[PDB]
Each structure stands twice: as structure tokens, then as C-alpha cells.
Amino acid sequence: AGSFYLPRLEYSTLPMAVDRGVGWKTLRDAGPVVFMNGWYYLTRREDVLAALRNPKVFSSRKALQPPGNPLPVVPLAFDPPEHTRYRRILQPYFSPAALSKALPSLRRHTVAMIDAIAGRGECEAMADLANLFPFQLFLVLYGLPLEDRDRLIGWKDAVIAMSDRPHPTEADVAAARELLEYLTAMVAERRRNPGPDVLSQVQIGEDPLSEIEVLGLSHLLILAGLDTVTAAVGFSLLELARRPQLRAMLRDNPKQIRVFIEEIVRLEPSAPVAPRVTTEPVTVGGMTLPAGSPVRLCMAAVNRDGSDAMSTDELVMDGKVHRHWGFGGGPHRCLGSHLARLELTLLVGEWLNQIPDFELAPDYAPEIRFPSKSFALKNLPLRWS
Ligand code: HEM
Ligand SMILES: [Cl-]
């Protein structure tokens, strides 16, 4: 029998502020396909992973190519074959082995940021560390002036806040303009005087990227690759603050910190859904969606679906295997997944090395702002002696 009765929920009502497990369970139990505020949400593992793996049918470009004549969103908003070329070009720069060479530098800068905090006996971990750490390391990785961090964070925040909004303010437009001008100058310089950095090297070789391609990639990294890590830092420190024995076991334990970070990305993925638009009719859960349907693939829900011991609502350090789709799946799987793991494991290890014992401030209940453009904690007040 076919499915003619589409479930509908109001997104803003999902019980998501306090516990993402309750929120995703509410959505998952509404059905395999759930219509919320213009989009068809695919909630079940079999459909989500098949859809992520089928770019011909579930297009990223149709969901993510901006209107007007913007910079190309390389590679997020491309489908094969163009996407395949982009990922082939970028893969070597983002591999675990390539990024491992940056580790002494990233570690040095992480230690410095922790140094400035540890003597206070308190911090608000989002404003004081999580919101700053990703851009600091980005400047280090890509060879940008360290003194530009304040301006760049301001620009990033303004651009993220204004995206997909009908009436941008004059301050928003100016911030977008200043960021674009700043990045344009940087890429042009790297094309004329290439160094042994990524943004220089991608513009040289047998198949190089154009200036406009590197400009679009640079914008995408800033808008997509930084706040995601910020969010994950907050959840990492929250769980450590309220689990003393886990904290103690993880200190000076890179093997177990790796596992912990996988659990944080599994359970609180910073981008819990991926948008696509269908290119032809498809049947999911017995229900046929016409061509051109806007869908959202629910990776965070799938990560919690209970189908095995690695997909529960609990933080699970045990078990031989840890696996998940918090970095997505299929060909668009997070280009920066290896960098995110490096940065998060580095932050946890170095935090524990200088601040092994800490706790949540009194009467603090962790929540996200929901609905909003962020799945990050609103704030995270920490205390230590
Ligand atoms: C915990 C941190 C992160 C999470 C949870 C995350 C999550 C994701 C997800 C789910 C996707 C797939 C989106 C889709 O299929 O439409 C994605 C793509 C991407 N991410 Fe991340 N990300 C993180 C960190 C980073 C970092 C650190 C970088 C680089 C600095 C980065 C750069 C990218 C890029 C360029 C893509 C597009 C890849 C493509 O379309 O082929 N991300 N990310
Ligand atoms: Cl406080």
C-alpha cells in the first residue's frame, strides 16, 4: 500500500532547547517523512544515508546555489562532475596526514589561549574561548595576520546572521563588503606570490582553481568551518564539566579523547540536517515526492536512532567501534572533518592539561537557542579552584 497521509509538524515547537534526544525523537516518531515549514524532513537511517549518497537524485546545487550572481560556493553547492573535481583538488590539503604537520603550531597557539584563562578560576567558555579558538587556528593554518582576528570574527558573525534574511541592514551590507574586499586582496596576492600554503597551492598545478573559486572556497571555510567547531568546543567542555571521572580518565589520554570527540560530534552535531532538492520523483517511506521537492536529511536524528549500541541517546565511551554521520555522508561529507577532530582533540587535551578539574557555575542549566541559526550552547559558565 502507498502512503497518502503526510505528517506535519511545526519546527519551532520541537522540544530541542534542553535535550536534542527528545527533539529528534519527537521528529523521528512522527514518520519517515515529516513536513515542517516548507521542507520534507527524511528522518530514518535507510533513507537519509541513501539520499546523502545519491547526488544525482538529491541535488546539493539546487538547494544551495544562491540567487543573483554570487561567488561560487566551492564545493558545498556543486554536484558531480564539478563537485568531484573540487573534492579531488582539495582532498590532499585536508587529510589527516597533511594536517598532522600543523600540529606543533596549532598546539602552541592552543596552549597560549588556555594559558590566558587558567589563572582566572572561571570563564564563560563560549565568549572567552569557543567563539575565538576556531578563527585563531584558521589564521595560523592559512597564514593570515594574527592581528586581524577581531575584525574577521566581526565580519563572520555579521555575514552568518544576515544570510537567507530578506532585509539586511546597512551594517550587514558593509560587513559583507569588507570581508569580500579583504579576502579578494589576499587571494590575489597568493596567486602572484605563491607560498607553501593551501590557498597559494590550489591556484597552481595541472588543474588549478581560479581566483574566484578560491575566493568562494575561502568564504565557505569561514562561514561553515568555524562556528561548527565553536559549537563542538562548548559541548565538549560542558560534558567534561559535569563528568568528573571521565575528565580524570581523559587527561593525558589522546586515545580516549579521540573517542570522546567522536561522541560529541555524534550527539551534538553542529549542522544536524543537510538540505537537498530532488531532481526527479522519489519514493521514501512508501511516499512519493515529486521532482523539485525541498528535503532536509536528518543526520542528528539518525545518530540517535537506537538501531545499535553506537546510536543511542547516551554518551558511550565503551565499545570497539564509534561511528556516526555528524560530519554528513556521501560525497559532501565534511571536507574539514579531519581538521575538526584535530582541533577538538587538541583543545580538550590542552584544557585538561592546565584545568584538569572544573565544574559548571551554580544553577546553570545548559540550553541552546531554539529555533535559531545555531545549535550551540547559549553560554557555558565554568568554575575551578
Ligand atoms: C565539528 C565541526 C564540524 C561539523 C559538525 C561539520 C559538519 C559538516 C557537514 C554535516 C557537512 C555536509 C553538509 C552537506 O552535505 O550539505 C559539512 C561540509 C563541509 N564542511 Fe564541515 N563541519 C565541521 C567542521 C568543518 C571545518 C573545521 C571545516 C574547514 C575549516 C569545514 C568545512 C566544510 C566544507 C568545505 C564542507 C563542504 C564539503 C562539500 O560540499 O563537499 N567543516 N560539514
Ligand atoms: Cl555567571
289 lies in which domain range? 1-385
In the chain the first and final C-alpha atoms are separated, in Å, by 64
Cα(150) to centroid(ligand 1), Å: 23
87 lines ligand 1 (CB under 6 A): yes
Ligand 1 geometric centre to CA of 199 (Å): 18
CA 366-270-294 angle, to 5 degrees, is: 125
Q: For helices 254-267 and 227-241, what crossing angle results, to 10°?
A: 110
Q: At CA 340, angle to CA 28 and CA 344, rounded to 5? A: 100
How many separate domains does the chain show?
A: 1
Which residues, 6 or more positions from 87, have their beta carbon under 8 angstroms from its beta carbon?
75, 331, 335
Give the method of determination.
Answer: X-ray
For the Cβ of 329 lying below 6 angstroms from any atom of ligand 1, the answer is no
| Single-letter residue type at 329 | G
Report the alpha-carbon distance of residue 204 to residue 197 in Å, rounded: 11
CB 138 within 8 A of CB 148: no
Q: Residue 73: CB within 6 Å of ligand 1?
A: no
* Contact criterion met (CB below 8 Å) for 180 and 149: no
Provide the grid cell at 203. Answer: 591556484
Resolution of the structure in the document, Å: 1.4
* Annotated binding-site members: 83, 87, 276, 332, 334
Cell representation of residue 241: 564539566
| CB distance 141 to ligand 1 below 6 Å | no
Nearest CA residue ID for atom 34, ligand 1: 335
Q: Which residues are annotated as a binding site for heme b?
A: 83, 87, 276, 332, 334
Phi/psi of residue 109, each to 5°?
-70, -35
**Any idea which ligand is nearest the CA of 124?**
2
> What residue has cell string 545519491?
54
Is the distance from the beta carbon of residue 328 to the nearest atom of ligand 1 less than 6 Å?
yes
Is 51 in contact with 42 (CB distance < 8 Å)? yes
Q: Which of 216, 66, 230 is nearest to 157 (CA)?
A: 230
Distance 334 CA to ligand 1 centre (A): 4
C-alpha cell, 147: 592581528
Say if ligand 1 is within 6 A of residue 338 CB: no
